[PDB]
Every structure is written in structure tokens, then in C-alpha cells.
Amino acid sequence: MQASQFSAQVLDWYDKYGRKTLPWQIDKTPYKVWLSEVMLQQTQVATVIPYFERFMARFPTVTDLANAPLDEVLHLWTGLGYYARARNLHKAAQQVATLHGGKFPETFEEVAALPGVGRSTAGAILSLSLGKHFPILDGNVKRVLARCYAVSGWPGKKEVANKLWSLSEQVTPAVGVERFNQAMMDLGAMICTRSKPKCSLCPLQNGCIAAANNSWALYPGKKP
Numbered sequence: 138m139q140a141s142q143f144s145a146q147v148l149d150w151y152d153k154y155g156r157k158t159l160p161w162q163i164d165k166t167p168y169k170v171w172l173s174e175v176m177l178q179q180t181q182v183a184t185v186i187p188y189f190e191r192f193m194a195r196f197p198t199v200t201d202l203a204n205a206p207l208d209e210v211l212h213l214w215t216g217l218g219y220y221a222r223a224r225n226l227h228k229a230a231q232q233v234a235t236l237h238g239g240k241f242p243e244t245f246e247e248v249a250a251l252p253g254v255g256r257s258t259a260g261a262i263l264s265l266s267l268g269k270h271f272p273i274l275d276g277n278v279k280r281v282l283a284r285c286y287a288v289s290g291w292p293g294k295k296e297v298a299n300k301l302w303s304l305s306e307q308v309t310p311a312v313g314v315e316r317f318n319q320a321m322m323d324l325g326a327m328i329c330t331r332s333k334p335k336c337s338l339c340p341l342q343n344g345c346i347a348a349a350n351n352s353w354a355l356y357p358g359k360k361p
């Protein structure tokens with residue numbers, strides 16, 4: 138599928154069916170988007186929402202989080218699992234307070250330099266909170282792109298990852314980047330699921346190679 142067609146069909150779908158009322162989407166800021174992205178990395182949205190609201194009430198700014206004792210952060214994290222995420226969250230808040238005067242940095246390299254924040258999470262923070270023109274590539278996005286364009290191979294292999302990052306850059310637009318990047322996460326989470334994807338509900342079904350061949354189980358590739 139032509140990349141400009143891909144982007145328009147996804148945005149039209151988002152306009153009518155997309156999620157726009159999660160707490161981190163109202164009055165968005167870099168701090169709220171970063172916090173939600175770290176919580177969502179390994180945890181489902183319904184479990185995260187009460188933790189996100191408790192963290193924003195106790196720590197209204199990144200400086201408040203930075204100045205708090207680590208044990209308090211770990212106590213509030215209890216139940217989210219994967220506590221290396223919380224240790225890195227506190228260190229990244231301290232780096233923003235120390236290097237950036239308590240205001241989130243706005244360049245890709247300074248955001249990716251935060252502990253716990255990789256290439257996709259950095260692009261997510263800058264695109265969703267500030268409109269900057271970066272793509273994302275989490276597991277939801279990998280699945281949609283690898284099925285639509287029939288990208289086989291394991292994404293843990295550098296050459297396969299490079300191909301998926303280039304495809305994501307190509308289909309991600311500048312106008313509407315915040316809507317498109319959330320829409321791709323919504324599609325992978327609710328429609329293009331790991332088992333038995335709901336192709337009849339998908340705005341890419343008219344050009345997707347996996348749908349044409351009933352071959353979604355091949356994409357993305359698994360580890361050998």
C-alpha cells in the first residue's frame with residue numbers, strides 16, 4: 138500500500154473510533170506522556186489508570202518526583218511488576234531536574250539519554266506531547282506493519298529492525314502525527330491482535346498482504 142494512503146486511512150479510522158479520553162491525553166505534557174509510556178510498557182491500560190492517577194496526585198511535577206525518596210516511589214509502584222522500570226523512572230526525573238532545570242528536554246538525543254527511555258519511547262514522548270515528527274515501533278506497531286507489508290524475519294535481528302523502522306518512518310505523517318501514533322497503538326492492541334486478528338474491523342484490510350493470503354501467523358517472525 139502507498140504510504141500516503143496508509144496514513145490517510147488510519148487517520149480517518151482514528152477520527153471515528155480512536156481512543157482520545159485516557160488521562161494522559163487530556164491536557165497532555167511531556168511528563169504525563171513519559172510517565173504513562175513507562176507504566177504501559179509491560180502492563181495493560183485498565184491496570185495502569187489508577188496508578189497513573191495516584192502518581193500525578195502525589196507528584197504533580199517531575200521535580201516533585203525527583204525530590205522524593207526512592208522507597209516512596211517503589212511503594213507506590215507495588216503491583217505493577219518489573220521494578221527496574223521504577224528505579225529508572227526516578228533516575229530520569231533526577232536527570233531532568235539536574236540537567237534541564239526541571240523542564241523536559243525537547244530534542245531527541247536529550248530525551249533518549251534518559252535512563253529507561255529507548256528510541257521508540259523517546260519518539261512517543263516528543264510526537265504525542267509536542268507534535269514533533271518522529272515514528273514509533275513498539276510491539277503493537279511492529280505487528281501491524283509486519284502484517285500489512287509482509288515483513289518476515291525476527292525483529293531482534295538488526296537488518297529486520299532497520300527495515301521496520303524505515304517502514305514506520307515512511308507511513309508516519311507530520312500533519313496529524315499525534316493522532317496517527319496513538320491510532321497505530323490502538324490498532325495493534327484491539328484489532329490486529331496476536332491471535333486471530335479482526336481484519337473485518339481494520340482500516341488497512343483493503344491493502345494488507347497478510348489479510349489477502351490469510352497469513353497473519355507469519356508476521357512478525359519469531360525467534361529461531
Ligand code: SF4
Pocket residue numbers: 281284285328329330334335336339340341342345346347348353
Ligand atoms: S488487515 Fe488484519 S492482519 Fe492486516 S493489519 Fe489489519 S488486522 Fe492486521
